[PDB]
Amino acid sequence: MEICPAVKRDVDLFLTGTPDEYVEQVAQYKALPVVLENARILKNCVDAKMTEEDKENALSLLDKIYTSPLCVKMAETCPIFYDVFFAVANGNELLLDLSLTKVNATEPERTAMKKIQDCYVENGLISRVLDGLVMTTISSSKDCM
Amino acid sequence: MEICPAVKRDVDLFLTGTPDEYVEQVAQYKALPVVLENARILKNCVDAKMTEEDKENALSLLDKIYTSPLCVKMAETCPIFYDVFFAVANGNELLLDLSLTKVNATEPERTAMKKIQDCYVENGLISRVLDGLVMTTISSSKDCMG
């Protein structure tokens, strides 16, 4: 089924918003200090690592995900998105690559998504993140039924 | 005004990242082979010369900078940071000490910052192309907008 619009919006803000806008949006879902600290580290990392072009290529890849039959025609909500997201958040390059092929990623699109994954990996942030906490809270929210 | 987050990130990586993490981050801004080579010499020196306590003390000092009125309340981006950073990179001990006094550095904080300065000096990197170029390019990046 198609992704919850609020999830799509979070990811779009993550990539394109200012750090303050992204974090204040995360805080509406989960206001734990550690979650907001991690969110800001991750956001600053993606902003610094990704060029405008990289961000464009990530947005094109996400659109391939959101329109894929592996997202929309499935019984539950956009399953391929979550597979991608959690491969990113946990630094699983193999699973990320397997999932990207499924949506016909170009090489620059793969490059861009790997930059996001690198930002989770960087400086040991993969060991810290509560992956699933924010995403679970958005995806199970009343606005997502 | 507050420092650009890309600048704070560059310094945090410099201190706490692996050498590869730091040098690669440098290469995202300036991929001249001389710059990358010089960055790696500097990073290996700071890792070998600074203990964990030294790194903790550099980080606490940098937090004093980033929250100082001489950073935040000024009209342009974090001026006291730049004064400190460039004093460190070009081995000006006098300006470093004066600038560390303006942010109420402790002695451990001062010791730690002088070790970073020593890594620029002892390795010959004052008269080498490195952090003038790199720091100018981060601070003027579209991300910082500067």
Distance CA A136, CA A133 (A): 5
Taking the CA of residue B104 and the nearest CA in chain A, the distance in Å comes to 26
Are B28 and A19 within 8 A, CB to CB? no
Taking the CA of residue A37 and the nearest CA in chain B, the distance in Å comes to 13
**What Å resolution does this PDB entry report?**
1.6
Query: Which of B6, B17, B21 has its CB closest to that of A48?
Result: B6
CB B10 within 8 A of CB B136: no
Are B28 and A49 within 8 A, CB to CB? yes
With contacts defined as CB-CB under 8 Å, which chain A residues touch B21? Answer: 122-123
Q: From the CB of residue A48, how many other CB atoms can be counted at a distance below 10 Å?
A: 23
Alpha helix ranges (H) inside chain A: 5-16, 19-29, 33-49, 52-67, 69-72, 79-89, 93-102, 107-121, 125-128, 133-139
Look-up of token digits 């499924």: A102
Q: Identify the CATH number of the domain in which residue B45 sits.
A: 1.20.920.50
Look at residues B87, B62, B64 and name the one whose alpha carbon lies nearest to residue B10.
Answer: B62
Query: Which of B8, B21, B28 has its CB closest to that of A123?
Result: B21
Distance CA A53, CA B31 (A): 18
- State the residue range of the domain holding A128: 1-145
In sequence order, the 6+-apart residues with CB closer than 8 A to the CB of A2 are A66, A71, A72, A77, A78
Distance CA B43, CA B45 (A): 5
The phi-psi region of residue B91 (left if phi > 0; otherwise alpha if psi is between -120 and 50; otherwise beta) is left
- DSSP assignment letter at B128: S
Distance CA A12, CA B114 (A): 43
- DSSP assignment letter at A2: P
Structure-determination approach: X-ray
Sign, CA torsion A121/A123/A125/A126: positive
Q: What are residue B74's phi and psi, to 5 degrees?
A: -75, 165
Look at residues B14, B75, B19, A32 and name the one whose alpha carbon lies nearest to residue B6.
Answer: B14
Distance CA B45, CA B79 (A): 27
B131 is written with which tokens? 């952090």
| Nearest-Cα residue of chain A relative to residue B8 | A44
Spacing of C-alpha B135 from chain mean position: 9
Distance CA A81, CA A118 (A): 18
Distance CA B36, CA A6 (A): 41
Buried b (16+ CB within 10 A) or exposed e, B101-117: eebebeeebbebbbbbb
With contacts defined as CB-CB under 8 Å, which chain A residues touch B10? Answer: 48
Look at residues A59, A38, A40 and name the one whose alpha carbon lies nearest to residue A124.
Answer: A38
Overall domain count for chain A: 1
Distance CA A11, CA A62 (A): 9
In sequence order, the 6+-apart residues with CB closer than 8 A to the CB of A89 are A120, A126, A129, A131, A132
- DSSP assignment letter at B91: T
Distance CA B19, CA B13 (A): 9
